[PDB]
Design a protein around this ligand. Sequence first.
Ligand SMILES: CN1CN([C@@H]2O[C@H](COP(=O)(O)OP(=O)(O)OP(=O)(O)O)[C@@H](O)[C@H]2O)c2nc(N)[nH]c(=O)c21
Length: 171
Amino acid sequence: MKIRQRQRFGRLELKRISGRGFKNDEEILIGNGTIQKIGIWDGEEEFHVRCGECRGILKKSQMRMEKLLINSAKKEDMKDLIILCMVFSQDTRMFQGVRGEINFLNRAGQLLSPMYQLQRYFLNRSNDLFDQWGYEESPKASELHGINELMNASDYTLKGVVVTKNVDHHH
Ligand SMILES: CN1CN([C@@H]2O[C@H](COP(=O)(O)OP(=O)(O)OP(=O)(O)O)[C@@H](O)[C@H]2O)c2nc(N)[nH]c(=O)c21
């Protein structure tokens, strides 16, 4: 239907544009050697995504971020959107990136649930994530360019992530 409330994953705002995922509770052995109970989504899905000023298209499958296209925006929003999408995608690389205990409390003194532990952890320790994520030679394409961990156009890109330029197509 035309009017749809957006879904939210902390700071990440999302709207699904294709696919049909199904959620199954699974036990996941993550990178710090602990087992986490997580509702894992299965199926190829694409989302419209946004964090602050940065907007993009996220394509995922089960525990895999396939492709992330985003616009150029303020670097903190670009970086946060990428991290939130890596976490949202439940990518195995993301799970494997965790070190030490994820036992963060909220302001009501309760433990965050596992997905929110992960969002909180990687937002504030992104080098853990990006190291595990992998880098590849940037795509050489006309309207797309890769980005590095500093959110700059580079010869090498975070794997699966692509940025568009702000171009005056209509003059
Ligand atoms: C990883 N997610 C998370 N998610 C949805 O994104 C929102 C934020 O996830 P969440 O806060 O972990 O949801 P949760 O607390 O598990 O509640 P729910 O029972 O709705 O899943 C929720 O609306 C959740 O349903 C998703 N929706 C789809 N279609 N595919 C997905 O892979 C995912």
